[PDB]
A paper describes a structure:
BK polyomavirus (BKPyV) is a small, non-enveloped, double-stranded DNA virus with an icosahedral capsid formed by 72 capsomers, where a capsomer is an association of a pentamer of the VP1 protein linked internally to a single copy of either the VP2 or the VP3 proteins. BK polyomavirus (BKPyV) is an opportunistic pathogen that uses the b-series gangliosides GD1b and GT1b as entry receptors. Viruses sampled sequentially from these patients accumulated multiple mutations in the BC loop region of the VP1 protein, which is involved in the direct interaction of the virus with sialic acids. All variant VP1 pentamer structures were globally similar to the WT VP1 pentamer with a doughnut-shaped ring composed of a central pore surrounded by five VP1 monomers in 5-fold symmetry.
Interestingly, while the E73Q mutation on its own did not induce any structural changes, when combined with A72V, as seen in the VQQ variant, the second part of the BC loop was switched (RMSD of 2.8Å) in a similar manner to that seen in the E73A variant. However, in the case of the VQQ variant, the modified orientation of the BC loop was observed in all five VP1 monomers, not just in the two monomers seen in E73A. This suggests that mutations at position 73 on their own may not be enough to induce a clear structural change in the loop orientation, which only occurs if mutations in this position are combined with the A72V mutation at the neighboring amino acid. However, structural changes seen in the VQQ variant are not directly involved in the ganglioside interaction. Thus, the structure of the VQQ variant is consistent with its ability to bind gangliosides. VQQ VLPs were able to bind all gangliosides tested except GM1, confirming the glycan array data. Surprisingly, no infection was observed for VQQ in any supplementation condition, despite its ability to bind GD1b, GD1a, and other gangliosides on the surface of cells. Hence, ganglioside binding was not sufficient for infection with VQQ variant PSV. Variant VQQ showed broader ganglioside binding, but this was not sufficient for infectious entry in ganglioside-supplemented cells, clearly indicating the use of a co-receptor for the variant entry into cells. However, the VQQ variant retained some infectivity, suggesting that the interaction with this putative co-receptor was reduced, but not entirely abrogated, by the BC2 loop shift observed in the VQQ VP1 structure.
Residue numbers in the entry:
A (entry chain EEE): 32 to 39, 43 to 102, 104 to 297
B (entry chain AAA): 33 to 100, 105 to 296
C (entry chain BBB): 33 to 38, 43 to 99, 106 to 297
D (entry chain DDD): 32 to 297
E (entry chain CCC): 33 to 37, 44 to 99, 106 to 296
């Protein structure tokens, strides 16, 4: 794709992208199944509803080319406003949660969290890395194929497109920094038992998606792809069991028309 | 729709206010606190009492009347804001659990939320529930007729923050798909031992102009301020826990703007 | 009011903390904390209550008037390394261990103004009975636990206004600059920086600094570093002095 | 490793990409990326750590295209490293709390990886220059490791004898060596150490972050003998087994380095 | 006397943590606590001290003086704390050794004369041991600000860190920077890079001027407490590297 000048035209698209934490029954939307532990890497068979997955959505756009002429037009993503939706819901310390102590309130959601988004002109490109190459992953998941011990560090065979919602477990996959030429991604992982969730909301924060040459992701087939993972931490039930809790992510993307050489 | 800043005599004004927190106020002596937290064992039977639920604060500030070809509107340019009474938490001598024998009282700490908005209309809110089956009490305005989807994103839960001491903080967030004519800022920090960290200074200003140099435009010459400042949990002698909240100060500088 | 800059001077001051000073050996400490079970009966002893520090620095009487204008301040908390003494009087972290560090709730605050600091009263417990020698909100109500606009005071006496009762008032102080950070919690680590390379500019948007009314400069502070835990598990506030170096210039104003 | 000629000519850019594997010990064929369980001796006088328990610095030398047709010219061309994009690969694999880990409490999830960590990279036109410093100069280091020679008690602070090139992968223990700030004129290095048994790992990924490698004079590392040197250490923290034993977990580091052709005096 | 306007000096300054025997260079003696302020007699080897070195500069001699323009500085050997296999308390049964952690202080100064210090004490009644220089004739005011307690950092391994701070009312001809982090479980956080430079020029563009052709470097790098198998605690410190760029300035 030879990139020419901006047309001077604009549009905004938006999306609330639901989280995919596992959803173990019809009432526990936004949560995973309780975490179970197998004593040994040798026999690790997690249930599907226990595994948070990456979220993704394809936003279709109208074709711009009256004829395909020497030059074509593509939608170009310029900026994104994004935020995690429902952060104040973790102030519900009155239902279902283990008491911090006798006569005390419920335990807050806390622990390992991951907050990730991407905007691209094509599906997010992912690289597989496993904690345990011998994990047996369940039907409905898409995980690294024919993993080896090298899969626990870096095995260049584990390449995937984030091409299915609620299928790619967050624990098996990361955005691939060796690809994603036509997407921008941003993530923070914070690990530990007692990590406090720290979440910010503001409508004043804009991420610019333009690269060094002033070019944003280009919607090559007239579609825009948004991707997310927002594991906020672990909910501790009265019983002591733990479940992931996730929140939806809002996207507002400003697009403009870009001329490219046919 | 937005034309030139109008300068001249009386083309600038400044308004200020203190917005009290709405933490629940469980009796006539415990203004600024919630009722003690109680925990029900299951999502199926979650019935919080009204006085246990901190709510969003909000007020409408009138501005000098402007005439309704271009409309004139007040444009909010800057805000100075801070939480009032942060040093009150250095009272460790009254009603608080002893950190240990011979020790002082337990500081306020734990989950906190600090939030403010300045807009030309009421703040627009999106509903999200920890537990869609929560039974909320009379006197609250909470997401109407919630479903399992209401635990993640249900687009039916749209509201204006149009009543003080009514919209529980746990049910509602600012809606990033709306608020075209407002600026909002919030930080949630969760966890049992989270330390409150609060800054005061009369030298810090937030600029409310967007990328085009336009601030919120005040419809019907009204400015809307919103806040929630849950500082954390106060731990009584017996180990019961209550929310503590503090008031928020606003000083807002405005200018006249030609429109449409 | 304010015309052109006319004529330089520097003043410096070390302002001692007022942590309660429970006896003549424990200067810089409060009396041990005691807890009363209920808000209905809360009568803190004077020596248990840290208070705001303040000094008035007189300046040459220059009298269209001329006024001293505060332009910059360099400020530093003095003695932060004294907290590395874990061999004197502190609870052992465990058997065979060293002493427990100073830690917990802290407040670091200073102000420079051309008049006394304007303060707003807010109370944890309106029914608190404060001791003789303290100045605290008069006629408090339940509304004094949030915002009660009656509670307005000038910081006009050293070692009298308890830190727990008063904050700088953001609705006043047009003629002062203030800065504070409160960090609350049982195990909060003190974090303190020193450098002689940091200057705070005191000029407002129009390039005007605080103007010294009646040729006086006012410095204010509170530096509660945390709690010292003694051998038996008692807790006391520890505070440190604050240094100020203020550059002033002469400013013309309208008569 | 991929070496891609993005542009040819005087304004030639070469992009070098590579994934550098961590060297945490690899105690068995199934625990690639982990150390051997930590064991503690009572005393400094009897400290003999096992080889597979000691994480080592990762390093590779990447050969670049020859630039000089005529070796006899008054001026020669060198590859100059101008930018690097880097990140740690597989950070989400720490969300597996279901495999082999101590429960946080009865009926709870697995304990996350946490504790002391070190995240470090370097890009240079020669091997990284290292200075030795030991916790305990009387440590007896195992065969297969390269550690400070004839250390003294002064080796626990600064002993200027302990100079080394990071010239072998999986051999220089992270605990014995740091980058030498008195040398490395032709390399850029960046590291953060965070110590404590409850330290949470905090790791960021983005394809938008670039580090500029030019010094004050606008000059990047110059690749001597057409050689680019990448080095890393990414100890994420400790994994706690069901038994309560603790092992280091490491992750691979990606590098994307942009290089230009600089004329230098022969 | 400063009128108008190159060399690089470098130093590895060793830490002075106490060094309780020939094998524990870089550590302090185990901590002991006395129950009361009235009876506080710490042993010399238990007390970390400020490090300092006088660095001779080429003689130049209306007069010319070396002016310090920039410093690069780094704490040396931070990865040594990844030894959790040697002499440390186990964090739980079968677990690894306890990391170095707790109270820390990281400080450096570059000056054209010795660092000027102000005394402040946790406990004015402490009796300090022979070989230390501590506040003379301390009073209860020594717990806050007592202007009697002025000293020059004029001796390596003599001025205990717990007794002295840099004096912000002096040091007109030096630049200093320190951070104190207090508490039992504070994690050490230490950064290395050869890309970071501190400019030493004041707002007028003048760096420290080297009197008697001498440059003074000062440090304190208490990393935290090492907890041995028995539960005893000792300070651990690391060396600090300095690389200082100097230029010639005409004075009178
Ligand atoms: Cl695969
Ligand atoms: Cl609704
Ligand atoms: Cl009053
Ligand atoms: Cl060696
Ligand atoms: Cl003295």
């Amino acid at each position: 794709v030879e990139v020419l000048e901006v047309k001077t035209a604009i549009t905004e698209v938006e999306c609330f992208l639901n989280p995919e934490m596992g959803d173990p029954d019809e009432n526990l939307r936004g949560f995973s199944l309780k975490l179970s532990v197998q004593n040994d890497f040798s026999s690790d068979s997690p249930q599907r509803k226990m595994l948070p997955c990456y979220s993704t959505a394809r936003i279709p756009l109208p074709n711009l080319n009256e004829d395909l002429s020497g030059n074509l037009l593509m939608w170009e993503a310029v900026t994104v406003q994004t935020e995690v939706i429902g952060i104040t819901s973790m102030l519900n310390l009155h239902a279902g949660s283990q008491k911090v102590h006798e006569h005390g309130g419920g335990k807050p959601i806390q622990g390992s969290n991951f907050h990730f988004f991407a905007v691209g002109g094509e599906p997010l490109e992912m690289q597989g890395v496993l904690m345990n190459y011998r994990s047996k992953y369940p039907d409905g998941t898409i995980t690294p194929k024919n993993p080896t011990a090298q899969s626990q560090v870096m095995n260049t065979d584990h390449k995937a497109y984030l091409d299915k919602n609620n299928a790619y477990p967050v624990e098996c996959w990361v955005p691939d920094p060796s690809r994603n030429e036509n997407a921008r991604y941003f993530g923070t992982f914070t690990g530990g038992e007692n990590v406090p969730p720290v979440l910010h909301v503001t409508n004043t924060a804009t991420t610019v998606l333009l690269d060094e040459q002033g070019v944003g992701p280009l919607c090559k087939a007239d579609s825009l792809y948004v991707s997310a993972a927002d594991i906020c931490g672990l909910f501790t039930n009265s019983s002591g069991t733990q479940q992931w809790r996730g929140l939806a992510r809002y996207f507002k993307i400003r697009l403009r028309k870009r001329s490219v050489k046919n």
